[PDB]
Amino acid sequence: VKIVTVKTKAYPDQKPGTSGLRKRVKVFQSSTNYAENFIQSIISTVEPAQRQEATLVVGGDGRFYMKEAIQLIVRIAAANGIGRLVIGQNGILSTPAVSCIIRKIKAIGGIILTASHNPGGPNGDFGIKFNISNGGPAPEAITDKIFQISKTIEEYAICPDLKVDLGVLGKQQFDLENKFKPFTVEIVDSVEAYATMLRNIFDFNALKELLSGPNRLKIRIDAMHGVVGPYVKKILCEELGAPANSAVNCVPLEDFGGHHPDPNLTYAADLVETMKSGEHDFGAAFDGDGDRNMILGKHGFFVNPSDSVAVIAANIFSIPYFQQTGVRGFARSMPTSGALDRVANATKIALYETPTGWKFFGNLMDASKLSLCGEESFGTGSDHIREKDGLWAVLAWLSILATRKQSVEDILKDHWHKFGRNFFTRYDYEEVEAEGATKMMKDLEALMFDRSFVGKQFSANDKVYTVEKADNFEYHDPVDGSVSKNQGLRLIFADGSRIIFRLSGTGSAGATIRLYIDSYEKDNAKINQDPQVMLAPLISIALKVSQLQERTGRTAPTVIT
Ligand SMILES: [Mg+2]
């Protein structure tokens, strides 16, 4: 084919976030050269001389416009000199499978066409994310470079006649006019490299015993019509042997079957209705692109994500990878509960508390100081790759059930009985007016910084909470040097309980207040109650010291997780 140079005009808004460039599907398809300038801007960050020998992994979550943005990447990458692109079959590759493949073949990076748990279809959202050579998300320095280039871009190169069959396994080669080396595109089974990686991490003979035997464990895995559907069928049913009705919504749909692929009790209510019946021993759900997960035990028992990372941490040697690797360190984002800290202190393993986001975890994993990490927002991972991994957390739970031979609920009651329970909840106030919400944060922080706040006591039934430390979290990264400030207000009490306030949506008309309550209970009489009843005293203290109702007019949160 011929390489053609197209003059373009730059856009002002293409600034990739930590999740790449997320925008409504109609913007990508209706704004002339929007996608073409973003893709050309990504490729321009690879020095022209390093491109011929380079390989780019390209894949997405199955959503609408994914096939159409992949043919565009092929046309621009070809005309720009990239030697090879490895693409998942039919365009499908979960975010953990793109991280696995970059690292495995030493790819220069990958482009993931996913807008994560967001909606797909003619009316949804579309996202373009760039991962770099360590298989993890591109850092600020690199997304910045892409931003600069996209705003000052005058031209892009494209082969307009190049079309690739994505449904075909194998190598496709194309000659580019007068050029001396051909462009190569390798289509790859979506699941194979990722399942061979997992076959080496976990013990598949113990898992085959656990799922296909006489006395097998009964499981129900909901992939929410997202990308993990093919991984669940090929690894769990076909290789490990679970019955085919163990896999639900396992066919990727372009609109995720009209629902949001977001793993929590109400977005995945279907799977919770199935669990209520008492039939299965274990249940799980995944987000759109496979890096997040929800765990459920028998009868619908919810395993909180902050408790899920502490159970794998307390039972990590039951997984072969960690027996061979050793545990290098534990980590949680700041707002996640203190359950993991209890296990790290009991076990004597370093615990790192970071701002939310993957970057702080990548840094520590690349420094060989982090083996397992978690986030309260259904996120769990290990250093096997440099993205979170939803199915990996399900196989780490199944390995703990195989080894322990007890139900999900008995593992948790047993954990709470050894370490104490960190009752935890996350309150979201969603379109708060921004002046009221900022004033609420500014006033609570002026109050918190008074020289006599530490020492202050609060009560709201039996227990008294004594303020031990109070601050606006700041993190100084030991690896890339960065200093992150203004990450959230914390009232840390001497008993191990904490109240955290973050204004995530800081500015648009609308703002989002996320309030996190973490209440430590060691009394073996209190550890088994409903968390909303046990957290009610500390939630009252939080609304009252913050004057949130007064500041926002809200009498209740939008969502309680
Ligand atoms: Mg995701």
Side-chain angles (χ1 to χ4, degrees):
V1 298
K2 52 180 189 292
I3 297 171
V4 154
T5 299
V6 178
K7 185 285 298 128
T8 200
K9 249 153 51 178
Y11 283 79
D13 72 286
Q14 276 161 182
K15 192 190 61 279
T18 56
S19 293
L21 192 76
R22 230 163 265 195
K23 299 293 163 168
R24 289 263 155 224
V25 177
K26 283 186 69 194
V27 171
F28 281 102
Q29 52 186 351
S30 66
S31 299
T32 302
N33 294 0
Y34 196 77
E36 289 81 350
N37 305 344
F38 198 56
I39 294 162
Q40 177 68 68
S41 301
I42 292 174
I43 277 137
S44 293
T45 78
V46 190
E47 295 307 291
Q50 288 182 112
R51 308 171 175 191
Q52 193 53 64
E53 309 314 299
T55 293
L56 279 171
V57 175
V58 167
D61 60 17
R63 81 181 56 232
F64 177 86
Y65 195 68
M66 179 180 64
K67 266 51 158 184
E68 183 172 9
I70 282 168
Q71 291 290 324
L72 261 215
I73 304 189
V74 174
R75 291 213 279 274
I76 290 147
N80 273 269
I82 282 88
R84 176 174 70 143
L85 303 191
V86 168
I87 307 174
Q89 187 181 26
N90 296 129
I92 302 289
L93 231 36
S94 68
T95 283
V98 180
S99 198
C100 167
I101 290 161
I102 291 171
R103 298 174 59 78
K104 194 195 194 159
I105 68 176
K106 308 305 177 244
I108 231 139
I111 298 180
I112 307 174
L113 296 316
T114 185
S116 186
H117 78 291
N118 295 102
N123 296 297
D125 297 297
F126 197 69
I128 290 171
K129 179 193 189 307
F130 182 54
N131 276 43
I132 57 149
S133 50
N134 63 342
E140 221 276 309
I142 294 293
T143 47
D144 260 315
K145 192 180 300 169
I146 292 159
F147 187 34
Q148 292 344 286
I149 297 158
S150 85
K151 48 188 178 55
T152 71
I153 189 170
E154 282 157 19
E155 275 163 329
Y156 72 84
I158 193 157
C159 294
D161 292 315
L162 213 166
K163 297 174 299 79
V164 184
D165 196 323
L166 263 27
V168 166
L169 267 22
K171 189 189 275 49
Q172 287 172 66
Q173 282 193 312
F174 315 73
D175 311 277
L176 307 176
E177 203 170 86
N178 308 301
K179 296 288 163 164
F180 193 89
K181 280 183 161 202
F183 171 56
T184 298
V185 177
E186 296 222 54
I187 300 302
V188 116
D189 174 78
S190 304
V191 184
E192 185 282 308
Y194 175 80
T196 298
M197 177 182 63
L198 296 200
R199 183 144 61 231
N200 283 302
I201 293 176
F202 299 107
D203 172 5
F204 282 15
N205 295 345
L207 297 192
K208 276 186 89 300
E209 228 45 74
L210 199 255
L211 307 176
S212 46
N215 44 15
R216 64 186 236 257
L217 190 84
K218 297 194 61 172
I219 75 179
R220 178 50 88 110
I221 307 302
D222 194 327
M224 318 207 88
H225 312 114
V227 90
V228 197
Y231 296 78
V232 171
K233 290 227 147 127
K234 291 192 184 176
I235 291 143
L236 284 172
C237 299
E238 291 174 34
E239 180 167 1
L240 298 171
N245 53 347
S246 299
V248 145
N249 303 311
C250 282
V251 175
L253 300 191
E254 292 196 291
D255 68 332
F256 304 96
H259 295 102
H260 301 265
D262 197 355
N264 65 49
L265 305 187
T266 55
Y267 276 101
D270 252 72
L271 198 230
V272 185
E273 197 184 9
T274 300
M275 291 295 306
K276 248 78 168 307
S277 91
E279 192 174 19
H280 319 267
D281 312 285
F282 180 89
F286 305 102
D287 70 330
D289 74 315
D291 71 335
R292 287 190 306 115
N293 69 290
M294 182 177 43
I295 306 305
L296 306 179
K298 204 169 173 109
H299 298 295
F301 179 62
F302 173 65
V303 170
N304 182 287
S306 309
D307 277 350
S308 185
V309 70
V311 178
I312 298 165
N315 300 270
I316 210 177
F317 285 125
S318 80
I319 293 162
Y321 176 83
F322 301 110
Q323 295 172 346
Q324 290 155 30
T325 268
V327 182
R328 282 172 302 199
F330 294 142
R332 56 159 178 89
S333 52
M334 187 274 286
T336 293
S337 109
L340 175 59
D341 312 46
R342 303 268 155 188
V343 170
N345 300 162
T347 270
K348 303 190 189 200
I349 290 300
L351 185 298
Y352 306 104
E353 157 169 53
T354 63
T356 72
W358 219 74
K359 300 48 57 192
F360 306 101
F361 296 146
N363 287 355
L364 287 168
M365 277 173 180
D366 293 330
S368 302
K369 301 225 80 189
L370 184 54
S371 289
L372 174 81
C373 68
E375 292 175 331
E376 59 69 45
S377 42
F378 300 94
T380 320
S382 79
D383 57 343
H384 64 107
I385 43 166
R386 253 95 254 230
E387 293 283 7
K388 288 179 316 299
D389 186 356
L391 190 46
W392 175 93
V394 163
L395 296 192
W397 257 100
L398 292 185
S399 312
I400 291 169
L401 289 169
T403 285
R404 294 287 292 271
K405 272 117 179 63
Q406 297 169 282
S407 56
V408 179
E409 216 181 58
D410 286 11
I411 294 188
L412 273 131
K413 286 180 205 158
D414 174 75
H415 188 96
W416 289 338
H417 179 87
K418 283 58 288 177
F419 299 101
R421 185 161 182 180
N422 276 80
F423 278 95
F424 178 95
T425 202
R426 197 218 308 129
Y427 267 31
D428 301 312
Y429 294 84
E430 242 120 51
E431 290 290 312
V432 182
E433 70 106 324
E435 194 185 36
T438 306
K439 174 180 151 55
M440 188 199 72
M441 295 298 285
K442 281 168 160 55
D443 284 5
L444 180 58
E445 176 180 22
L447 158 163
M448 277 165 40
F449 291 176
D450 183 66
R451 74 294 144 144
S452 35
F453 197 72
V454 178
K456 182 159 206 306
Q457 304 182 356
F458 297 101
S459 47
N461 216 320
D462 195 53
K463 181 141 90 148
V464 173
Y465 292 96
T466 310
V467 176
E468 168 183 285
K469 187 169 199 314
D471 62 358
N472 188 343
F473 191 69
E474 168 200 66
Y475 184 76
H476 298 67
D477 196 289
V479 169
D480 66 357
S482 77
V483 185
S484 291
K485 314 205 181 82
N486 194 45
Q487 297 303 306
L489 300 166
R490 323 136 81 199
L491 286 55
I492 300 169
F493 304 99
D495 69 315
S497 304
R498 292 176 297 151
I499 280 168
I500 299 96
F501 287 94
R502 290 178 63 240
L503 174 73
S504 70
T506 348
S508 169
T512 306
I513 300 167
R514 296 176 127 109
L515 158 59
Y516 313 82
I517 313 290
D518 181 354
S519 168
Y520 185 74
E521 209 59 72
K522 181 65 203 207
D523 175 9
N524 273 232
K526 290 177 183 64
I527 65 136
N528 263 289
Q529 312 227 79
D530 171 357
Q532 293 315 309
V533 167
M534 303 298 303
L535 296 161
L538 203 60
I539 291 169
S540 183
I541 287 166
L543 296 177
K544 282 176 171 38
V545 306
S546 57
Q547 297 301 288
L548 192 153
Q549 196 186 286
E550 295 82 353
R551 285 310 147 245
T552 77
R554 297 292 166 86
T555 49
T558 302
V559 182
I560 292 180
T561 299

